Amino acid sequence: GYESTRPLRYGEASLGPGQPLFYIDDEEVDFEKVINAPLPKVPRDMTFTAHWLAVEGVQPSIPQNPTTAEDLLPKG
């Protein structure tokens, strides 16, 4: 039961001053709500591409490479 995609919520109870208790947040629902709900979205199929990361030791400024704006060269 730990593969659920629902968000995990916690509720808080009190045993007194400074004595909190935590319980899992659940709630009874109807079968109509669960059965009639829509399905999630299907992701696209696996694929691959290619591009030049460097040419003769220099990275070109193409959309597929990171921008210069955003520690790679020695400075000793």
């Binding site: 696209r44 691959f48 591409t49 030049w52 790679l72 020695p74 000793g76």
Partner: protein
């Protein structure tokens, strides 16, 4: 003092104080030349064969002679049918033996041929050199290359010149120059070739900087973190990924259709395929020495062998208790090794269902494997309380070297192509370079971030190293800095950053060019 302990232990233990190869080589070399020369060089094809065949008949290797004659009959089925039939002692053979073949050639072409033969002397060059010196005479002339429509033939035909004696003597230049349309110093020539070639050797490195390198990146989309392992084939034609969903997926790297030998699958159009049959996550994939066979290992504890011609499993190996983590083909692809959770290193051949060698001595799980380029040694690394590297001999099954010094989980091992240097990487960002014969550490390389360096690769001459990291960077390392002319270590040559793609595999080609692969995470 460990030295005192070792000395005491040693003191107390009693220690005192054939022709077809050459023909194919020549054929390929002729195929790789410029067109303007191809007319001349082909004249060498017919003699080298005939005499060679006769030689076998003289040495009693009748079966080899028959095989050679049959294999090369196709190349000459359209011209030499009568001669082939006669060969399959006659007076023609006696004439061949008594009269040495004449092979006219150009001076520069002869020089190129001699230098090429010397350059490949031990791979088949010696055979052709001996055959030419014994049963041939290469009458060299200072003319230009001769072709049916080159300047030489056109000029000679237009001016109605005669036929030169050297080129007079089953196709010959005469039929191209006829109206119907010098000697040699072999052996001495080889000596001169070697003497002159010895004058252009580079013998040091003083000053300058490292070497420029190009990189090509392959990126995988819509994987959702299900990809566990990746591998490239030997010729950079295929890529395979194993996932957490128990299946393997293979793609052709240029998008062309993949081919199947099944009759029903004749002329099928798909450029990727799925290998199904494991029951748990796949943690290793290894291409065999075009690649025909694939090896995989999974968390279910099994090793599987697949055929890439029919795309189906052939054999299952079941020698492990618990998950298998790594599997590796040998340098030439008949032996292979595996390791995993139960702390033992196993060596198999594809011939036998049971492992042929078992290696015991690690105190923890195995996390990395590597072979030696000679095929007789293996390397293993363990984690946790025992972070050491062990070297195993395959003939006996014993350990011969232990390397110590890592304090983080080890992710990769790699041996240099010269068989003398070892490299390892861990999750702290360090790379250790070890001398194998002395068992000592040569040096450390720093600059990668933390998380793991899954892949390393050496260049053809083993003077440069390339590493790929989970910090989304690819880095290049100088194995020896040049002599003084008089966070990151100074031996790094280059670092290339990727666009939100951790690097899983990097490999060097024959040139100063590398290929890397990874999965894109937009978040």
């Amino acid at each position: 003092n460990l030295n005192q302990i070792v000395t005491d232990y040693l003191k107390k233990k009693g220690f005192t104080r054939k022709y077809l190869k050459a023909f194919l080589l020549l054929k390929n070399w002729i195929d790789n030349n410029l067109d303007i020369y191809k007319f001349e060089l082909r004249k060498l094809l017919w003699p080298v064969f005939v005499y060679s065949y006769l030689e076998l008949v003289s040495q009693g290797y009748v079966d080899d002679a028959k095989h050679l004659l049959e294999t090369l009959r196709s190349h000459f089925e359209a011209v030499h049918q009568d001669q082939l039939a006669l060969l399959d002692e006659n007076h023609t053979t006696r004439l061949y033996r008594e009269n040495k073949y004449r092979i006219p050639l150009n001076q520069s072409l002869s020089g190129n041929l001699f230098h090429f033969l010397e350059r490949e002397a031990d791979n088949g060059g010696a055979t052709i050199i001996y055959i030419l010196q014994t049963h041939c005479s290469v009458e060299t002339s200072a003319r230009g290359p001769i072709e049916p429509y080159s300047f030489e033939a056109i000029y000679r035909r237009a001016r109605n010149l005669d036929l030169d004696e050297a080129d007079a003597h089953g196709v010959t230049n005469r039929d191209v120059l006829d109206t119907s349309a010098r000697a040699r110093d072999v052996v001495m020539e080889m000596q001169k070739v070697r003497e002159n070639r010895d004058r252009f050797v580079i013998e040091g490195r003083t000053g300058g900087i490292g070497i420029p390198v190009s990189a090509c990146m392959f990126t995988f989309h819509n994987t959702l973190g299900t990809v566990s392992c990746m591998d490239f084939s030997n010729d950079h034609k295929l890529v395979a990924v194993g996932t957490m969903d128990s299946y393997i997926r293979v793609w052709s790297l240029d998008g062309k259709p993949l081919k199947s030998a099944l009759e029903n699958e004749k002329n099928l159009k798909v450029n990727n395929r799925k290998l199904i049959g494991h029951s748990g996550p796949v943690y290793g994939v290894s291409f065999s020495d075009s690649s025909k066979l694939l090896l995989s290992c999974s968390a279910d504890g099994q090793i599987r062998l697949w055929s890439l011609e029919i795309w189906a499993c052939l054999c299952i190996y079941k020698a492990h208790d618990g998950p298998v983590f790594r599997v590796l083909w040998g340098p030439h692809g008949h032996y292979f090794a595996s390791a995993g959770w139960d702390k033992t290193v196993r060596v198999f051949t594809q011939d036998h269902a049971s492992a042929v060698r078992i290696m015991v001595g690690h105190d923890t799980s195995i996390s990395a494997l590597a072979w030696h380029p000679n095929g007789t040694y293996v390397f293993s690394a363990s984690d946790e309380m025992d972070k050491s590297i062990r070297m195993w001999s395959v003939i006996t099954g014993n350990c011969v070297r232990i390397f110590t010094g890592h304090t983080h989980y080890i992710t990769a091992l790699e041996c240099a192509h010269n068989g003398k240097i070892l490299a390892s990487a861990d999750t702290g960002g360090n790379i250790f370079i070890w001398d194998i014969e002395k068992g000592t550490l040569i040096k450390k390389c720093r600059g990668h971030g933390k998380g793991g360096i899954p892949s390393l690769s050496f260049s053809a001459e083993s003077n440069v190293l390339v590493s790929g990291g989970l910090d989304c960077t690819v880095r290049v390392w100088d194995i020896e800095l040049p002599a003084d002319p008089n966070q990151i270590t100074p031996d790094q040559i280059s670092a290339f950053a990727t666009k939100k793609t951790p690097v899983l595999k990097v490999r060097f080609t024959r040139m100063n060019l590398i290929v890397a692969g990874g999965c894109y995470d937009p978040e």
